[PDB]
Amino acid sequence: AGRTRIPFNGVGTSVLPAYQTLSAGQYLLSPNQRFKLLLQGDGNLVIQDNGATVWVANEQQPFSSTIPLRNKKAPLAFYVQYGAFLDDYSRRRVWLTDNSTFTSNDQWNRTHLVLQDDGNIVLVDSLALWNGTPAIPLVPGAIDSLLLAPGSELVQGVVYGAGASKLVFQGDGNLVAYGPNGAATWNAGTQGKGAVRAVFQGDGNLVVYGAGNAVLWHSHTGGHASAVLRLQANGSIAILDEKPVWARFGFQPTYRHIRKINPDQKPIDIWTWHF
Ligand SMILES: OC[C@H]1O[C@H](O[C@H]2[C@@H](O)[C@H](O)[C@@H](CO)O[C@@H]2O)[C@@H](O)[C@@H](O)[C@@H]1O
């Protein structure tokens, strides 16, 4: 019939995946460790800022609803199933988020909660089109991630950094991501093949071209103009198609979502909204 929930086992990371039960005592941390989202034993779901409570989930939160919980046997739990839900029998309530209008049932599988470095909690419909480093965790919401927008050329020799990690279209023609310890976490394997150009194209395909526009390697992610290329500080490299569907601040259901930008017009992995 449907998806059932499993227990959450990612305490201290920045993301609560779909259909995972966060129980009392468990918490998320923003990638910069400044913010913590904590389900307390008293049934309050709380965000702390360097250890000081600055938000509590209740009826006062815009775009949320509180309804009766009749089931006495329902454990204290917080989980995401497109919308987020807090089951709190101690106060006879289910506190839940009023997300923006759903577009397909597949969103139920793709939508997870992110605790961002700016303290916002955001529900994000997230699809990893390509993951170059499946062994390295995806870490959304980090100010130190490097994001490349579609239409971004990787200039040969330029070192694009995300913390201590880097992505480089090298002199030898290889396209390589290096992790924080200096070792390569991923490479296209295009060294010594005559590579002249590496580009994250407007169609969302990452492509390394040789002489005569010959294709040497590509991510097979063409046809996704809203995708971004992300290099994380932990060495992860991936191409993701993502959109937020709720947040505790900034979000309005009728507003346009957009990523915040650096003073040099480069996007960062933090969602914001406007008209
Ligand atoms: O795998 C990343 C690595 O790829 C290429 O190096 C390969 C080979 O040519 C090297 O000699 C050996 C050891 O030095 O490692 C690889 O198998 C290079 O493009 C290199 O810069 C890159 O880090």
Residue numbers in the entry: 2 to 276
From the paper:
Putidacin A (or LlpABW), first identified in Pseudomonas putida BW11M1, represents a class of Pseudomonas-specific antibacterial proteins not related to any known bacteriocin. The crystal structure of LlpABW from P. putida BW11M1 (LlpABW) shows it contains two β-prism MMBL domains, referred to as the N-domain and the C-domain following their position in the amino acid sequence. For the protein containing two similarly folded domains, we constructed site-specific mutants affected in carbohydrate binding and domain chimers from LlpA homologues to show that mannose-specific sugar binding mediated by one domain is required for activity and that the other domain determines target strain specificity. The LlpA branch occupies a unique position among MMBL-domain proteins, harboring non-eukaryotic representatives and being equipped with the capacity to kill bacterial cells with bacteriocin-like specificity, a property not yet demonstrated for other family members.
Soaks with oligomannoses revealed additional sugar-binding subsites. Binding site IIIC accommodates the disaccharide Manα(1–2)Man and the pentasaccharide GlcNAcβ(1–2)Manα(1–3)[GlcNAcβ(1–2)Manα(1–6)]Man. In the bound disaccharide, the non-reducing mannose is located in the Man-Me binding site while the reducing mannose faces the solvent and does not interact directly with the protein. Although mannose-containing carbohydrates can bind to the IIIC pocket of LlpABW, it remains unclear if these are part of or mimic the natural ligand required for biological activity since bacteriocin activity is not impaired in the presence of excess mannose.
